[PDB]
Design a protein around this ligand. Structure first.
Ligand SMILES: OC[C@H]1O[C@@H](O[C@H]2[C@H](O)[C@@H](O)[C@H](O)O[C@@H]2CO)[C@H](O)[C@@H](O)[C@H]1O
Length: 291
């Protein structure tokens, strides 16, 4: 598995092992935990435990025990601890982890199971044995060096919304946004910027109060000429919408609710440099997809 957008809520760097920390939000379905680190050359085993509390006597129940072990075969042992008792063991062989090799673990929470990919490859599924709402602490123990842990909750779409584009911008790349305009909305914005050069390749600014759709670029510390021509303002306060920003070789093509609205000749020519998406304004953000 791979993430199209980097928009993590909490981030922790270099926690000391053993590390036991409180999960900053509820693991509702769709929630992501990203763990980046590497295993030392002398690693016998390490484990990532999703727990209900952090008591050690009685040992706190472990809803999800993810335990990579290094041996001739190499595997990941998964299990659950309830009232200090382990349940049915589930072993996944052909382990993706290696001594002296770095790794990225993406744990996805679903309604009935955790889905786990390591280094961009599906690794294993583990059905919930404990309700996920009962999980409130992340424990990490053993021989492993953790660089960072990050999270993505249901709240990942609050405004302002800022997200890095793990896929560099280029012809054929699509960015769709779905949401609902606030009942008393004035305006909102969707910008595609080249994070580095502090430039805005594309500024999509629907202004509802004056009922116009402004698009422009902010280049070299200066706003350019605004483009407002349009067959009809597609937005209404309180209206559901989907907007498709399609990057083409000659321009950006944007549609709303299944209808082409406008084209925008590229002003920033280094497309591959457009690596940042920002959404703000008077809307309720429902979904953002980089493709
Ligand atoms: O089941 C998870 C739990 O296993 C303990 O060790 C197991 C071991 O995995 C298995 O091969 C053997 O047959 O039984 C042992 C006793 O449960 C680990 O010590 C513990 O840390 C967890 O990984």
């Amino acid at each position: 598995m791979m993430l199209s957008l980097n928009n993590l809520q909490n981030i922790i760097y270099n926690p000391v092992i053993p590390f036991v920390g409180t999960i900053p939000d509820q693991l509702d379905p769709g929630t992501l935990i990203v763990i980046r680190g590497h295993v030392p050359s002398d690693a016998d085993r390490f484990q990532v435990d999703l727990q209900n509390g952090s008591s050690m006597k009685p040992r706190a129940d472990v809803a999800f025990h993810f335990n990579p072990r290094f041996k001739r075969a190499g595997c990941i042992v998964c299990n659950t601890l309830i009232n200090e008792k382990w349940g049915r063991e589930e072993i996944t062989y052909d382990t993706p982890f290696k001594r002296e090799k770095s790794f990225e673990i993406v744990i996805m929470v679903l309604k009935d199971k955790f889905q786990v990919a390591v280094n961009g490859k599906h690794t294993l599924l583990y059905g919930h044995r404990i309700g996920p709402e009962k999980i409130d602490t992340l424990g990490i123990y053993g021989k492993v060096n953790i660089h960072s842990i990050g999270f993505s909750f249901s709240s990942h779409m609050r405004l302002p919304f800022a997200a890095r584009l793990n896929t560099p911008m280029g012809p054929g790349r699509t960015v769709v946004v779905k949401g609902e305009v606030n009942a008393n909305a004035k305006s909102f914005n969707v910008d595609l910027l080249a994070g580095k050069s502090k430039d805005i390749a594309l500024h999509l600014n629907p202004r509802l109060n004056i009922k116009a759709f402004v698009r422009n670029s902010f280049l070299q510390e200066s706003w350019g000429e605004e483009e407002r021509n349009i067959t009809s303002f597609p937005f209404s306060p309180g209206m559901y919408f989907e907007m498709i920003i399609y990057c083409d070789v000659r321009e950006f093509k944007v549609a709303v609710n299944g209808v082409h609205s406008l084209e925008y000749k590229h002003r920033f020519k280094e497309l591959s440099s457009i690596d940042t998406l920002e959404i703000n304004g008077d809307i309720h953000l429902l979904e953002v997809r980089s493709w």
